[PDB]
Amino acid sequence: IASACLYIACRQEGVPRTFKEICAVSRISKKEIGRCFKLILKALETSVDLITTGDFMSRFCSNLCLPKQVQMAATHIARKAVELDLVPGRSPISVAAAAIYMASQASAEKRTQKEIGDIAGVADVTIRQSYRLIYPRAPDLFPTDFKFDTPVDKLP
Amino acid sequence: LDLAGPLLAFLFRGMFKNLLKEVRIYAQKFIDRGKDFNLELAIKTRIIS
Amino acid sequence: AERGELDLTGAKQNTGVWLVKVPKYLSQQWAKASGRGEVGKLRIAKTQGRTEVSFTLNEDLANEHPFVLQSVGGQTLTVFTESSSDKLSLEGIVVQRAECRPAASENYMRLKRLQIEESSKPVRLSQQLDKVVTTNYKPVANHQYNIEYERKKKEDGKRARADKQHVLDMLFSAFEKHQYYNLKDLVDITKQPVVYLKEILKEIGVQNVKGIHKNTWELKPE
DNA sequence: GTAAGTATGAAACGTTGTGCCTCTGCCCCGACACAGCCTCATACGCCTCACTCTTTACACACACGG
DNA sequence: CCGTGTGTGTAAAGAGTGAGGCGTATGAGGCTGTGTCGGGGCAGAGGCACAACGTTTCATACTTAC
């Protein structure tokens, strides 16, 4: 119940965390955290605004050593990708991880899928799946005024 | 003369002993239950802070 | 003559030995090879009314150690050895004590400073960390212990309700081992549901109030 | 007129007395099977690929010696 | 001078680990139901470590006969 309340409060104040970021702190697994979250939302007769991909951008890119420019680039990529429906029905966290990966690979500071998965708590397979959907549309998602040393025109 | 350092070191050992006592109590509950314990969850960070 | 007997023959011969205090670097160099059978030569020079003791370091070992004697009348010292075959013997009696000092004074401290610094390597100090740690509580769906416990609970499964005859036979068979059993301990031996086990135990067994620990079940119906 | 006890003001340990935890059951549950579709998310597993030092083979070479 | 007596290139096995993608399996969730049983903090016994007068003791002057 305490873990569910903490998750609800974090979601409400506008700095939502992921269930995996509360499980890593609490002594229970994600399943019970989610069950108690739903039970509390049902009992309290309250609701929480749906999480957006931009909410996990700042924390994910601050845990990583990415600069602020790469953070803004990833946020813009993810927002445009969700607007363009390139990732239909996929969790916002996977989309955020894919945007962070592409922004890091295109920028001077490069990060592999493993580190991004550990930071965001997303399996590298999910990162690849969410990255291939937005792979062909890499350039138009980037900010127009974006400096880089590794061309956005070529990426893994 | 007990300056800031030695004064702070006096507090830290009392607060660190509580931290080590707390993890012992937390671990003992899980070990007796038969299940291993998570180290991150055993540590009470508010004790020192 | 026994295992604990001490071979005091050395004392009978009144053999004399010298006790020497030397620094670690001199012994450390000896400990380097420690198997060549030679580390230096001990030179003693005597005059009409004065005696001086000095030691010279081997040239190969290096790649003056003056000795000062001390009075031994204030304390009597003896040297004994324990054989690996459990045969203790007395090597002899100390007749003189000596100490070794360094010929150099200024640059000698430099070697000591290195030793003090070298012994300071295990002295761990707090390290400043440029970036706050963000790996603590890294996101994970299930704790490794939590999945293992869930798998173990699913594997062993719940205890089943065995037939009364089999449960009764096990209870009576175990009664011979000890007069009284605890309900919790008895459950493990019988491996039956607590409610079901209690009903069976109530049907025949009874609980007696004991003033030493607490009221415990007695397997004897009477 | 002391003697054998009579009274009196100190210590001193101990037996109920008082707490002080410490279990002991005991209700009070959730989670097991398992039914379809459903979509996304997580885990496993297995063979194909890589590669890398370390030999492994084999045509050829270059003296060597009697 | 044709025997012999040793080197050398370089990809070819020989292991020796190691890695990566993919495809299958799993899960979680709503739901609804039905037998049953451990569980993780719980309302109620149960017996010991202090604990607090207290009952006896012990000289030490005195009480009471004798």
From Swiss-Prot, chain A:
Q: What is the effect of changing R128A?
A: Reduces DNA-binding
Recorded consequence of changing K31L: Reduces interaction with VP16
Task: List residues, modification N6-acetyllysine.
Answer: K80
Residues holding DNA:
K31, K38, R90, K114, A123, T126, R128, R132
Q: Where are the sequence repeats?
A: 60-136
Q: What results from changing G89V?
A: Inhibits interaction with TBP
In the record, the effect of K80A is given as: Abolishes autoacetylation, represses transcription activity, does not inhibit its association with chromatin to promoter-specific regions and decreases the association of GTF2F1 with chromatin to promoter-specific regions
Swapping R137E leads to an effect described as: Inhibits interaction with RNA polymerase II
| Tissue expression remark | Expressed in the inner cell mass forming the embryoblast. Not detected in cells from the outer thin layer trophoblast (at protein level).
Q: What is the effect of changing R35E?
A: Inhibits interaction with SSU72. Inhibits interaction with VP16. Inhibits RNA pol II transcription activation induced by VP16 but does not affect basal transcription
Q: Where in the cell is it found?
A: Nucleus; Chromosome
Q: What is the effect of changing R27L?
A: Reduces interaction with VP16
Region Core promoter DNA-binding: start-end pairs: 31-35, 91-94, 125-128
According to its UniProt record, how is this protein modified after translation?
Acetylated. Autoacetylated; autoacetylation at Lys-80 stimulates transcription activation.
| Top-level taxon | Eukaryota
- Location of region: Necessary for TATA box-bound TBP complex formation: 86-156
Stated role: General transcription factor that plays a role in transcription initiation by RNA polymerase II (Pol II). Involved in the pre-initiation complex (PIC) formation and Pol II recruitment at promoter DNA. Together with the TATA box-bound TBP forms the core initiation complex and provides a bridge between TBP and the Pol II-TFIIF complex. Released from the PIC early following the onset of transcription during the initiation and elongation transition and reassociates with TBP during the next transcription cycle. Associates with chromatin to core promoter-specific regions.
The text the record gives for the protein's domains is: The TFIIB-type zinc-binding domain is necessary for the interaction and recruitment of RNA polymerase II to the core promoter, the formation of a fully competent pre-initiation complex (PIC) assembly and basal transcription initiation. The C-terminus is necessary and sufficient for interaction with the TATA box-bound TBP complex and for the formation of PIC.
Tell me, how does this one assemble? Found in a ternary complex with TATA box-bound TBP. Part of a TFIID-containing RNA polymerase II pre-initiation complex (PIC) that is composed of TBP and at least GTF2A1, GTF2A2, GTF2E1, GTF2E2, GTF2F1, GTF2H2, GTF2H3, GTF2H4, GTF2H5, GTF2B, TCEA1, ERCC2, ERCC3, TAF1, TAF2, TAF3, TAF4, TAF5, TAF6, TAF7, TAF8, TAF9, TAF10, TAF11, TAF12 and TAF13. Associates with TFIID-TFIIA (DA complex) to form TFIID-TFIIA-TFIIB (DAB complex), which is then recognized by RNA polymerase II (Pol II). Found in a RNA polymerase II initiation complex. (Microbial infection) Interacts with HIV-1 Vpr.
Annotated family: Belongs to the TFIIB family.
Task: Provide the protein name.
Answer: Transcription initiation factor IIB
**Which species is this UniProt entry from?**
Homo sapiens (Human)
UniProtKB/Swiss-Prot annotation, chain C:
Which pairs are disulfide-linked?
Answer: none
Write down which residues bear the modification named N6-acetyllysine: K21, K32, K121
Has the keyword 4Fe-4S been applied to this entry?
no
Compartments annotated for it: namely: Nucleus
Could you tell me the keywords of this UniProt record? Acetylation, DNA-binding, Nucleus, Phosphoprotein, Transcription, Transcription regulation
Residues annotated with Phosphoserine modification: S126
Which InterPro entries does this one have? TFIIF_beta, TFIIF_beta_HTH, TFIIF_beta_N, TFIIF_interaction, WH-like_DNA-bd_sf, WH_DNA-bd_sf
Q: Which GO terms describe its molecular function?
A: DNA binding; RNA polymerase II general transcription initiation factor activity
Regarding protein family, the annotation reads: Belongs to the TFIIF beta subunit family.
- Role this protein plays: TFIIF is a general transcription initiation factor that binds to RNA polymerase II and helps to recruit it to the initiation complex in collaboration with TFIIB.
Subunit structure of this chain's protein: Heterodimer of an alpha and a beta subunit. Interacts with HTATSF1 and GPBP1. Interacts with URI1. Interacts with GTF2B (via N-terminus); this interaction is inhibited in presence of GTF2F1.
The name this protein carries in UniProt is General transcription factor IIF subunit 2
Source organism per UniProt: Homo sapiens (Human)
Gene, per the UniProt record? GTF2F2
